[PDB]
Structures are given as structure tokens and as C-alpha cells.
């Protein structure tokens, strides 16, 4: 006996050693160097589209890789595939489970997945030859609700779940290629990388992790956060990433710098960050907040460049076209607002 | 022009079929009453319905469609997912009434109830209360080895409601105790002070009698109070 105690001393103390390695790296700060940067000035978006199609509150969105289409999931069990330009409905899919907490669009547009409290990953094919959109493949390996997912390809796809673990699946076999574990809570948010080498994930342990898609190992654990991590998005180039949290602060972390880059907070905001997303360059950081006002920050200068009026109820989801051509805002008002 | 005109026509029909489907969807959907049933375990949440996934229940009662849901398939970290339901007609909170022993996990029920009651997202949701294990509560209380009075001393001086309903052969402390817990949820009811939602007690395990009459009539009244409240009466 008395082994767990020394385990605690050696374990946490070592943790202190890692902390030492982290803080020694602090030779500069992004804020120090942003003095020289010309800021953005007051620049705001405007409502280019008002999308009235949903009966219930819109809980999540995703862009189609064409920067044209975008996918929306509704709490009513309807999964609607929308068209930005013609503002019509590209497809309408009845869900098996009325509760959908997320959905995503395939890189090729072949498939679209959704998920929620149903504990199952619903894969729908857009290529159905016999007819309209039908259930293509269901992936149920999860011991917890289906929180989120994003496509690596048409075959293998990452999912996150309240089972506290993340999973890399393959549709055809119906099994998981590999399963990633080691967070202490539900994995609430994820963002894949453009190069799909590795992926970040936010969870309820107030820590953002970088895993490796292929290796199956935890590469890095970053803890700067004050509270739970609601939403997280990797930087376009793959070298950095942004974090939304319940801390009521959006925070910027680097993978390669292995420590906190920057903190965005405000003295007047008691409400958490629902969702986050980038700009083309990564100079602008979009943040949706529970106050129903979306602050547009300058991911470098750190001052809010602008704000988004909009939905009268909570902002659920936020997304930017792969080419950064457009911004999309889902809320619980059943209305989608598209901005630029 | 051929592509744009041609898509206006084809996609136009797409829009017509989809939208007409939508109007067919909103009426059937919104006409139903979705309810969130949750309890720790041994809640006889499957018993009330026994007399789509296993969790979801589709039922017809008195020309009123109901959608019950069981969260029994999820882990106990709820703060993330429980926000999914702020339009749900009601949160049914089902607790075993005899759970004061083991530790008094009913005290946990109290705390969780305060939790649901306190969320900004649930401010608009009324909580229908299911006190399960009524008889088991009464008997368990008479057992005495583990005492409520440690965890609820105020029972000695907290007073019987005027409408007292003892069962045949029932020591008055048992009945008043029952309503006493109910009142214990009542001070919680006044904790908000908003008046948007309310706690309606219920009794199960007393007999197998259906809660549907309760469940319905109370739900009916609740949403009626959404209309009334939004109609500036209250």
C-alpha cells in the first residue's frame, strides 16, 4: 500500500516539470508584437440572407466544400440541406431520432452525417441511385451521445461523444479504425485539419488536446482555459487554433508553440462562447456568444473589430466557407443568418 | 440563362415540394407535446409507459399526441446536453421517494432540481415532479434506522398542509412528511420568483394507476399558462 500517494507526488510534481518547460518558452507574446500591426478599424458584417426554413431551433451547421451549399440540422428531427445563392432547400431529410446535436458535409458531398443524443452516427448518401436521400450507413459504437463529427474523406471520419473518448471510424466495415481516449470529460467540439494529419478537440475537462489521426496517440495537451471548452477551430494553415469556452473568453493557442498565445475576454460579458470560426487570413476571429451578439475580434490586434446583431435567441453554431467567402450563423430562433 | 432559368424551374419544384412538406411538418410536430423524463435509476420510468429508440415514446391520449423521452442512455455529465431542451413542454423529474437512506440521495435530487431550476436556458421550462416509491417512502420512513430528521430536522416544526390526505392506517407524520418533501420543493419553487414555471407533485408506487390523467391535465394547464403569460394575464 501507500503506492498511490507517491504516484501522486511523482505525477503532479512531474507535471510541474512540464509546466517549467512550457513557461520557459515565453520569450515573446503575440500582443507585444501587435503594436506595430495596423488594426482592422471598425468593420462589421451585414445580413445578406435571412433564411426562414426551420420549425424548431437550429442547432448546428456546416459548409459544403463548394462554398455554395451549407447543411443545417434542426432540433425537430429534420435535416435540411440548404443553398446559399438560390435560398431554396437542396434536400430535406427526416431523421430517425428527433434530437440532432450536429451534422457535417462530406469533402466530396457524397455523404452527410448527423448525430445527437441518439448515440448513433447517421450517414446519409447524397448519391442514392434508387431514389432520394435515404439512410446510407449508421455507425453505432458509442457509449455516449453523439456530440460532433467532421469528415476526413468519404470513408473514414472522426466523431466525438460524451463517452469522454473520440473515435476514428470507417463506413464500409462499420467499425472504428482507431479509438482515442484520455480526456476527462465529454468531447464537445472538434475541428479537423486541412491536411488531416492531426486534430484538435475541446472537452469538458477544460483542456484542448491535439491528437494524431494515424498514430492513435495523444500528441499534446494544452490547458489555458478558465472553464469548459464549447467550440474549437484549427487555424487554416494547420499551425494554430482558436478556442471557444464557457470562460467567456476566446483564446488562441499554437500547436507548435505549445503554450497560450493569447486571451480574448471582456469585462461586460458573463456569457459563454457558443461557437468560433476563422477568417481567410486568420486575422479575424468570429465569436458567437449567448448574449445573441456575435463579436468579431481581430485575431492579431485582439480588439473587437465589430459585432453581429442578429438572432434574438442563443447562437448555436457558426461557420465560414472553406474559401472564407461567407459567414453563416445558426441560432435557436429557427432562422439562419448569413453575413459578410 | 438556360442554367439559371432551368434551375429556377427544377429547383423551384424542389422548393415547392420541400416547403409544402414543411408546412405539413410544423403542424404535426408542434401539435405534439415533448416531455423530458429523467431520474437517476430504478425510476419506474418504463413502468409508467409499459401498461424509434427505446427512449422515445409515441402515444395517443385524449386526442393529444405525446412524445416522452428517456435520457437513461447518457452519462451523468449533463450540463452540455441538457441545454438541448428549452422548448420541451416540460421537464419530468422522477425521484425515488424512499431514497433518504443510502446518504439521502434524495438530497441529491433536491440539488439537481435546483440545478435545472436555475439554468438560464431552462428558465421557461416547468418541472413536473414525480415522487416515486410512495409506499416505499412511508414504510422506509417508519423503519427509522437511517433518520431523515438528521437531514430534515425542520420536519418537527414544519406544519401540515390544510388538505391532509392520510392513507388508511397511516401515522400522520408519514403523510405530512410526504407533503413536507413536496413543500421542500416548494421553497425551491419560490427560489426563482419568476412565476414562469411551477412544480406539480405526483405519486407513484402507491398503486399502478396511470399518471396520464395527471401528466396530461397538468401539461395542458402549463402550456395554457405559456399562452396566458404571453397574453399578459399573469
Amino acid at each position: 500500500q501507500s503506492e498511490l500517494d507517491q504516484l501522486r507526488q511523482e505525477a503532479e510534481q512531474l507535471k510541474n516539470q512540464i509546466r517549467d518547460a512550457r513557461k520557459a518558452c515565453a520569450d515573446a507574446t503575440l500582443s507585444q508584437i501587435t503594436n506595430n500591426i495596423d488594426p482592422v478599424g471598425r468593420i462589421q458584417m451585414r445580413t445578406r440572407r435571412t433564411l426562414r426554413g426551420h420549425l424548431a431551433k437550429i442547432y448546428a451547421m456546416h459548409w459544403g466544400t463548394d462554398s455554395r451549399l451549407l447543411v443545417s440540422a434542426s432540433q425537430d428531427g429534420k435535416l435540411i440541406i440548404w443553398d446559399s445563392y438560390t435560398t431554396n432547400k437542396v434536400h430535406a431529410i427526416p431523421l430517425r431520432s428527433s434530437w440532432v446535436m450536429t451534422c457535417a458535409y462530406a469533402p466530396s458531398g457524397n455523404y452527410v452525417a448527423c448525430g445527437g443524443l441518439d448515440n448513433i452516427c447517421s450517414i446519409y448518401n447524397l448519391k442514392t441511385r434508387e431514389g432520394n436521400v435515404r439512410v446510407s450507413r449508421e455507425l453505432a459504437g458509442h457509449t455516449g451521445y453523439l456530440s460532433c463529427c467532421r469528415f476526413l474523406d468519404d470513408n473514414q471520419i472522426v466523431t466525438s461523444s460524451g463517452d469522454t473518448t473520440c473515435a476514428l471510424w470507417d463506413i464500409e466495415t462499420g467499425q472504428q479504425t482507431t479509438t482515442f481516449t484520455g480526456h476527462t470529460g465529454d468531447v464537445m467540439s472538434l475541428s479537423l485539419a486541412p491536411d488531416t494529419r492531426l486534430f484538435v478537440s475541446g472537452a469538458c475537462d477544460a483542456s484542448a488536446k491535439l491528437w494524431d489521426v494515424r498514430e492513435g496517440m495523444c500528441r499534446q495537451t494544452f490547458t489555458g482555459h478558465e472553464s469548459d471548452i464549447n467550440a474549437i477551430c484549427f487555424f487554416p494553415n494547420g499551425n494554430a487554433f482558436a478556442t471557444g469556452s464557457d470562460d467567456a473568453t476566446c483564446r488562441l493557442f499554437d500547436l507548435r508553440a505549445d503554450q497560450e498565445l493569447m486571451t480574448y475576454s471582456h469585462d461586460n460579458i458573463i456569457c459563454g462562447i457558443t461557437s468560433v470560426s476563422f477568417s481567410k487570413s486568420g486575422r479575424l476571429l468570429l465569436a458567437g456568444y449567448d448574449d445573441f451578439n456575435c463579436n468579431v475580434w481581430d485575431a492579431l490586434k485582439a480588439d473587437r473589430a465589430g459585432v453581429l446583431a442578429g438572432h434574438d435567441n442563443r447562437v448555436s453554431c457558426l461557420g465560414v466557407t472553406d474559401d472564407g467567402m461567407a459567414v453563416a450563423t445558426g441560432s435557436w430562433d429557427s432562422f439562419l443568418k448569413i453575413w459578410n | 440563362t438556360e442554367d439559371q432559368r432551368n434551375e429556377e424551374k427544377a429547383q423551384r419544384e424542389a422548393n415547392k415540394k420541400i416547403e409544402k412538406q414543411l408546412q405539413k411538418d410544423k403542424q404535426v410536430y408542434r401539435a405534439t407535446h415533448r416531455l423530458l423524463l429523467l431520474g437517476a435509476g430504478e425510476s419506474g420510468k418504463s413502468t409508467i409507459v409499459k401498461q424509434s429508440g427505446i427512449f422515445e415514446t409515441k402515444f395517443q391520449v385524449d386526442k393529444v399526441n405525446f412524445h416522452m423521452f428517456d435520457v437513461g442512455g447518457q452519462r451523468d455529465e449533463r450540463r452540455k446536453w441538457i441545454q438541448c431542451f428549452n422548448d420541451v413542454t416540460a421537464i419530468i423529474f422522477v425521484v425515488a421517494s424512499s431514497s433518504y437512506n443510502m446518504t439521502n440521495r434524495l438530497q441529491e435530487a433536491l440539488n439537481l432540481f435546483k440545478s435545472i431550476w436555475n439554468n438560464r436556458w431552462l428558465r421557461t421550462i416547468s418541472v413536473i415532479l414525480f415522487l416515486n416509491k410512495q409506499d416505499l417512502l412511508a414504510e422506509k420512513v417508519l423503519a427509522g434506522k437511517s433518520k431523515i430528521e438528521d437531514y430534515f430536522p425542520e420536519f418537527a416544526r414544519y406544519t401540515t398542509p390544510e388538505d391532509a390526505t392520510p392513507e388508511p392506517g397511516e401515522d400522520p407524520r408519514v403523510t405530512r412528511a410526504k407533503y413536507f418533501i413536496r413543500d421542500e420543493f416548494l421553497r425551491i419553487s419560490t427560489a426563482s420568483g419568476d412565476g414562469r414555471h411551477y412544480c406539480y407533485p405526483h405519486f407513484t408506487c402507491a398503486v399502478d394507476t396511470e399518471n396520464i390523467r395527471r401528466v396530461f391535465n397538468d401539461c395542458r394547464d402549463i402550456i395554457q399558462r405559456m399562452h396566458l403569460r404571453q397574453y399578459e394575464l399573469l
Partner: nanobody, 128 residues
Framework: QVQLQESGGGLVQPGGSLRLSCAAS????????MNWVRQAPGKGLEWVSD????????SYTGSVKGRFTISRDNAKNTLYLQMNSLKPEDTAVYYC?????????????????????RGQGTQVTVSS
């Protein structure tokens, strides 16, 4: 990181008094509703006592009501449990946990097994 350092605990003969401390860091202790939650030997989690940021809103479990003192030092960002009326039935593993969400009323702690914000905890034992 996010950490809470529990002090105190040990063997105490019933009836004493103790000022328990919890060190907060990795977050602003001022903004979080605090509570002491115990997990009894071979028993599930149970909420024990919570305190508001201001230290005004304060609730206890029925037994510990008024007989136990939860007190927070925000300026020092540390938490306290002063024990009176100690019983061998109160002996348990005491964790000091913070409510997850900032600036709120509800809390989703006392969650069995995994819970984000919690220290290593102490053992508080009341001899017979």
C-alpha cells in the same frame, strides 16, 4: 492547468472544529460558485455545501445546515470548511469542487465518477 489544493483532513475525535482550505488556480475563483462535496467510504457522491461568489447565497445538506461552516476567501482565492459537531457518520473523502459554469446559479457537480473541476481531495476521519 486547473487545480484545487485540498488541505486539512485526518483523524479527529468527534466534537472538534477545523478550518479546511482549498487552493484555487487556473481560473478566477471570484466568479465561480463554490462547494464542498463528499464521497463517503463506499458511497456515491453527495452534495454537501455550496456558497455564492459574494458568500451570501449559502446552502447546506440537512445535517450540516448551520452546524458546518463553508467560508470563501476570494482575495486569497481559497475555500474553507470549519467543522463543528463532528460525527463518525460524517467521515468521508472530501473534495472541494467549483461549479462549472461561470456567473450562474445552477451547478452540475456531484456528478459521479468524472467531474472536471476537483482537487485530489482529503480524507476526513472521525474516530469512535
Amino acid at each position: 492547468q486547473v487545480q484545487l489544493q485540498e488541505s486539512g483532513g485526518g483523524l479527529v475525535q468527534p466534537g472538534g472544529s477545523l478550518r479546511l482550505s482549498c487552493a484555487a488556480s487556473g481560473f478566477t475563483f471570484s466568479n465561480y460558485k463554490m462547494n464542498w462535496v463528499r464521497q463517503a467510504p463506499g458511497k456515491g457522491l453527495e452534495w454537501v455545501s455550496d456558497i455564492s461568489q459574494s458568500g451570501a447565497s449559502i446552502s447546506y445538506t440537512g445535517s450540516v445546515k448551520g452546524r458546518f461552516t463553508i467560508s470563501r476567501d476570494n482575495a486569497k482565492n481559497t475555500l474553507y470548511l470549519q467543522m463543528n459537531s463532528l460525527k463518525p457518520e460524517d467521515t468521508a473523502v472530501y473534495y472541494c469542487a467549483r461549479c462549472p459554469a461561470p456567473f450562474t446559479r445552477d451547478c452540475f457537480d456531484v456528478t459521479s465518477t468524472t467531474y472536471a473541476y476537483r482537487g485530489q481531495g482529503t480524507q476526513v476521519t472521525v474516530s469512535s
